[PDB]
Amino acid sequence: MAEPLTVSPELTANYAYFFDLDGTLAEIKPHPDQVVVPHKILQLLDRLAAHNAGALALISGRSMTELDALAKPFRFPLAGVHGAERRDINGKTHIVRLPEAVVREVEALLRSTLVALPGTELESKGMAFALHYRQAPEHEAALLALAQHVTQHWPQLALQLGKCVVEIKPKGTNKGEAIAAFMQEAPFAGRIPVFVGDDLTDEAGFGVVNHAGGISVKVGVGATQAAWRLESVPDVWRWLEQINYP
Ligand SMILES: O=S(=O)(O)OC[C@H]1O[C@H](O[C@H]2O[C@H](CO)[C@@H](O)[C@H](O)[C@H]2O)[C@H](O)[C@@H](O)[C@@H]1O
Ligand SMILES: [Mg+2]
C-alpha cells in the first residue's frame, strides 16, 4: 500500500529528519566494517540539519560509537541499539542498563552455540546482542529458535529480527520510542517527523510517525506500514540531494 515518494521538502521547511543507517544511507555489505556513508552524503545530511535548527538524527541498530565512526567528521544526535542508546542535541547520552549477571550469562550461552556453527557472528553491544548469519543462511532457523529461548528465560530481553540477523535487545526498546523521545525535545519539538528506514526494526518508527502526522519512507523491497517508498539506497542519496539543491 506504500506509494512512491514524490515529496522533496524545501531545504528550510518545518521538518524533523530521522535516518536509518544500514540499508538506508549506506549500501548493505557482507560485514559491517565494510560499510561506508559517502562523504558527499554526510555533507548533505549536515547541510540539511543546519537549515532545520539541527533537527536531524540517525536512528540505528548499531552502537553509537560505530555511528560516530561512520559519520566522521560529523556528530549528529543519535539513537543506537534500536533505542537503548541515545544522544540528544546537547550531547547528553541516555543508556539502558542491564544487570551485569544477565549480559555475562547470555553471552556465554550464545558463544557456546556460535563457535560450533560456521559462518555465524555473535556481535556484543553492551546491552544487546546480534546473531549475524549472512555468510551461512542455512543457520537462520537455529539462530531464531536460540534467541527465542534466550528471551523466554530472561524476560528483560526482547527479540528483534532483521536482514540476515536475529538480534536480542532490552525489553521496551524500539525505534518508535527513540523517535518519541527526540520529538519532545528541542530542536525536534514542533516539527513534522520524517523517518526513512529499510528493515523490521524501522516498522516501530514508521508506526509512531504515521500516527504523529509525519512522513514514513520504506527503502527497498518488502511489506511495510510506511506510507511512502524509495527503491534503493541511491534513491535515498538522490532524494537527499534533491532536498538541498532543487
Ligand atoms: O542502522 S540499521 O539499519 O538499523 O542497522 C541494524 C544492523 O545493521 C548492521 O547489520 C546490517 O548491516 C550489515 C552490513 O551492511 C549486514 O552485513 C547485516 O547483515 C545487516 O543486518 C549491524 O551489524 C547491526 O549490528 C545492526 O543492528
Ligand atoms: Mg537498516
Q: How many CB atoms are located within 10 Å of the residue 193 CB?
A: 23
> Is the peptide bond prior to 187 cis by the omega test (within 30 degrees of 0)?
yes
Q: Are 134 and 30 in contact (CB under 8 A)?
A: yes
Nearest atom within ligand 1 for CA of residue 24: 3
Q: Which amino acid appears at position 39 of this protein?
A: H
What DSSP designation does 149 have? H
| CB crowding 146-163: b at 16 or more within 10 Å, else e | bbeebbeebeebbebebe
Q: How many CB atoms are located within 10 Å of the residue 94 CB?
A: 13
Grouping H, G, I as helix, E, B as strand and the rest as coil, residue 151 is helix
Grouping H, G, I as helix, E, B as strand and the rest as coil, residue 63 is coil
Q: Are 183 and 17 in contact (CB under 8 A)?
A: no
CA dist., res. 224 & res. 218, Å (int): 7
Q: Which ligand is nearest to the CA of 140?
A: 1
Bridge-based pairing of strands 121-124 and 215-219 is: unpaired
* Cβ of 22 less than 6 Å from ligand 1: yes
Residue 233, all three cell numbers:
539506497
* Cβ of 130 less than 6 Å from ligand 1: yes
Give the H/E segment covering residue 228.
strand 228-230
DSSP result, 51-111: TTTT-EEEE-SS-HHHHHHHTTT----EEEGGGTEEE-TTS-EEE----HHHHHHHHHHHH
Neighbours of ion ligand 2 (CB under 5 A): 20, 22-23, 198-199
Nearest atom within ligand 1 for CA of residue 21: 1
Q: Are 119 and 133 in contact (CB under 8 A)?
A: yes
Resolution attained, angstroms: 2.5
Q: How many helices (H) and strands (E) does the chain have?
A: 7, 13
Q: Is 22 annotated as a binding residue?
A: yes
For ligand 1, the distance from its centroid to the CA atom of residue 22, given in whole angstroms, is 5
Q: How many CB atoms are located within 10 Å of the residue 96 CB?
A: 18
Q: Which of 165, 169, 218, 233 is the best mutation target for the ligand 1 pocket, counting ligand atoms within 8 Å of the beta carbon and taking the most?
A: 165
For ligand 2, the distance from its centroid to the CA atom of residue 101, given in whole angstroms, is 30
Choosing from 20, 68, 199, 202, the catalytic residue is 20
Bridge-based pairing of strands 93-95 and 85-87 is: antiparallel
Residue 158, all three cell numbers:
526482547
| CB crowding 46-72: b at 16 or more within 10 Å, else e | bbbbebbbbbbbbbbbbbbebbbebbe
Q: Are 181 and 94 in contact (CB under 8 A)?
A: yes
Q: Shortest CA distance to 197 belongs to which of 207, 187, 208, 206?
A: 206
* Cβ of 114 less than 6 Å from ligand 1: no
Q: Shortest CA distance to 7 belongs to which of 235, 237, 215?
A: 215
CA dist., res. 244 & res. 47, Å (int): 8
- After which residues, if any, is the chain broken (C to N > 2.5 Å)? none
46 is catalytic: no
Q: Which amino acid appears at position 150 of this protein?
A: V
CA dist., res. 217 & res. 196, Å (int): 5
Q: Are 35 and 23 in contact (CB under 8 A)?
A: no
Query: Which residues lie across from 123 on neighbouring strands?
Result: 130
